[PDB]
Design a protein around this nucleic acid. Sequence first.
DNA 1: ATCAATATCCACCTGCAGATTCTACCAAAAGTGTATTTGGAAACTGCTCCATCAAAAGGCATGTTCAGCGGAATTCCGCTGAACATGCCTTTTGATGGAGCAGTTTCCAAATACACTTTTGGTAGAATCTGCAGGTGGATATTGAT
DNA 2: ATCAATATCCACCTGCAGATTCTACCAAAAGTGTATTTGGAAACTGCTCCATCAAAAGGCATGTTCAGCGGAATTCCGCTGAACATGCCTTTTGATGGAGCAGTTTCCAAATACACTTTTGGTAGAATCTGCAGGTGGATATTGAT
Lengths: 98, 99, 14, 105, 105, 94, 98, 86, 79
Amino acid sequence: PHRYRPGTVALREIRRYQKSTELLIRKLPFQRLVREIAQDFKTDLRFQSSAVMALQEASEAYLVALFEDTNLCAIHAKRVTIMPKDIQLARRIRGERA
Amino acid sequence: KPHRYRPGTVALREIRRYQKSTELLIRKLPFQRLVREIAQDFKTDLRFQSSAVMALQEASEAYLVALFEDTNLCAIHAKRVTIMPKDIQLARRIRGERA
Amino acid sequence: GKSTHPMVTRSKAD
Amino acid sequence: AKTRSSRAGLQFPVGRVHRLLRKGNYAERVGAGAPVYLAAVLEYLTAEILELAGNAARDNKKTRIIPRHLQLAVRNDEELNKLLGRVTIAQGGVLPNIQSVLLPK
Amino acid sequence: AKTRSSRAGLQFPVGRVHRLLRKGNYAERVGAGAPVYLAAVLEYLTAEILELAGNAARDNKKTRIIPRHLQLAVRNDEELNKLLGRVTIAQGGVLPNIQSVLLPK
Amino acid sequence: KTRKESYAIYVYKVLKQVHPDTGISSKAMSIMNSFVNDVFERIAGEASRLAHYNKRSTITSREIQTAVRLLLPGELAKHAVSEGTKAVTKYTSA
Amino acid sequence: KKRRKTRKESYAIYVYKVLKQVHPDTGISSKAMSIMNSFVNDVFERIAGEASRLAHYNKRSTITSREIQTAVRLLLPGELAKHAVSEGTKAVTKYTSA
Amino acid sequence: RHRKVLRDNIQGITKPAIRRLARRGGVKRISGLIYEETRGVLKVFLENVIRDAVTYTEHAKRKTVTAMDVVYALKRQGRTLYGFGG
Amino acid sequence: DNIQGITKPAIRRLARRGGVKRISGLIYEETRGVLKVFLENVIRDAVTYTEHAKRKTVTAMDVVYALKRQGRTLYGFGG
DNA sequence: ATCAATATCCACCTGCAGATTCTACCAAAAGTGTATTTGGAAACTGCTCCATCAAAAGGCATGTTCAGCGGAATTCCGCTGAACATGCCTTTTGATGGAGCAGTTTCCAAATACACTTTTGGTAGAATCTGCAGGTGGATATTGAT
DNA sequence: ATCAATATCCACCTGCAGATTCTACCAAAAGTGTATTTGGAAACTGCTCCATCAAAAGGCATGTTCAGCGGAATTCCGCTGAACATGCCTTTTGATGGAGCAGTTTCCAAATACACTTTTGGTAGAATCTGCAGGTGGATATTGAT
Ligand SMILES: [Mg+2]
Ligand SMILES: [Mg+2]
Ligand SMILES: [Mg+2]
Ligand SMILES: [Mg+2]
């Protein structure tokens, strides 16, 4: 057998997804979530196809940027593992949490 | 016999104290000198309304006080009780002022 | 001194 | 002679809100109801803040609202805090708040 | 017959920019030079991004600029980055960047 | 010479109805004025955007209402829409 | 009985002209063009809005090229503003000479 | 004409997908508690944008959420998006 | 040197209002830099408003407008 | 636990800055009314794009195993930062003249708005061209075991 | 270090979705004219801002001592990554029905323009009031040494 060490494949994946631009959440599951959430606000809603895609472009852009900030908080704590308290500190400082 | 409070005690007393009041905490004249100095680079022979300088102070101190809070959260996040430059730098980075 | 203001504030609605 | 504010039951100036809407270049026309509605909203929010500030003044055994009472009023209300999340009240100070890890044993 | 863009030496449409300033309710009146000036600035900034995006495309042996190329152009220029600090370019991805502490020893 | 307008007398009127035994410093009143001008711009600006997005040239109370719903958090939005509708109703009956 | 579809106007042909001036052998995908279109509209609003505020703050009822200029100085970072004011003034002068 | 029932769809935001987003964000190692926290943060994000977007839909008296509704809502939240019509 | 007029005790007090208990000695110099950047950004804009109005006097309104566009709205000096 | 030094709390007093009440003037702003004009709702309907379905296949999710290496607990020593007394200098304050410049009024040329026609550029849809995405194959760069 | 397992890089091929060029129609921009309005140049005035000085006040710079804290070294258990087997559900493609979006015509309630009268809000200036900041006294809670 041949096994890359812990961290090696992780760094390859970082280089990989930082190199490309395709969406990383599956298309249909994301569409279901949008419709589920939208339904609870108001019933009998339809969505332009581009409206859902816009919501996905925005959501992934948002989440990626947050993980960057989350990563900085972990490293600030001399860890390399991201944790909920890292996300929480980040959103607090961004003014999303307070 | 002399009497000495332990490190942190007055610090906590001062926190309670300045968190209770609202008066500006930088001396007025030094701040006023700094403001005019900085402005001189943008336009020479400038006058300032008295309130304009006060507005700049209200804003600057409000800004710095909030920044120290975030800075404090970053120090504690790193399991310290002492704020440090990297704490200010992390806060400013996440706020999007530094990047 | 009771509010004689005719508008329902959130505290009024509880 | 009878003012529009009185017609709507308001202390806030409907006519002035109307005039300010025209001058502000928000649109070509302004409907007759928009300033009535907006003046009501502005008055309601004013009442909301004055209420909580009066309480803040009263808690401090003061009868005169100062900027500190406005600050305490807003920062202690989750919803007003949000609305004014990017606003600075001069001479307001901050809410008393010490991180528990900083406290003595 | 001579278009206002040519009189001003511009590729961007002065007349359209003029009309858009009117419909947008920015003021009662709009000066004859404002659309000329604004159309020039919009064209300048466009040339600026396209220059840098074109290079990004060239670096990847592509002749057709895609959104990835616009992203690279903008995030690598300190000033466009700031100008678009709150903007999300769809299909743009991010810049390669690994925090050094995460690298092997 | 020229009059500097303010919401101050209106803010004072409301104060006397909600806290008839409470007063307000001039510094606190200035802050209240900043507040009313601020919310005015925000709602009016939002309504402005709304009408343009929909190719309408009139700002009606409907534009103000949607504006309020967008800007005000949870419950504040609710009571504001309520008072807004109350006033318009009352106004029309007169 | 046919109907005319309402034209969605765009900055697209103008961007293309400018694209050809800087990179005469380079083209642009339609997604990239849409983003450029978003870009031009965005900066348009931002500048005009800032200019609108300017005039109102000064009790002027006219937006002149001077309001655009100050607006640009307020919105654009350092160097971008410098060259923008240059192009802007260059153009306004040229236009007046006709 | 029997519309089906949508529920638990947040789990459609899978662990591998969350891991991929973290990788693009430059993240190397991920605590097991992250995936649930991420879904929570995403849900709040979508609630806020969709609510504003639908508010634009209702105001326009439409029954269809357009891309522009999403674009205007994002702009309000201070998260301007390019590429869909602004 | 005018930035140094923002003294160590003064910076310490602001931090105390921010709830800070222990302060590294390197903080004060870092703070002054941060304050200088803050004032530069706000003042540049304010003075830009000043020039546009053809005045030689920076008004409180100039500062208030500058703060608003920087996203740091201030109440109490005009609105 | 005792005991002392020091901070903190509370009731009461009072001089005064800041707030309030009183009055007059007036320009400007709000209301009222008639005359006029236009936007946006309604009804109608053409057409686009959305919801849904069917079918086939593989890319990708799931759940497991197994061990490396990360996080967190613990210990500990050096050093940094807090407390504090000493003494000195910067800031604050309040007055004064000095005056620079902001704010007000009037004036009038230039600039813009407004309206009618003519002209032309930008759009949409149809036909035609081509960059590159996706797959294959082979040389080389990287990683990890020994 | 050497060597094997695996990822990565790069060149070539090609069918086609997507881009570009081509053509015709019309809405929008340009041209010309008269009517209207704004903002600036100019003169002026009162205000607020700068400079200065002096005096009382008080905060800050400094140096020392020591406690408590930050960071380094060490240890280890459990978590989280790499790899794999399995199979499912997402993706792709192509069809259809029809909900609802978007274009068009008509018509009136609502809005605007104009003229004219009443009211009110802002200013100023004088006189008067009053909430509470600052200070005192004296009781006790807090903190730290022993
Ligand atoms: Mg539901
Ligand atoms: Mg640059
Ligand atoms: Mg240069
Ligand atoms: Mg399975």
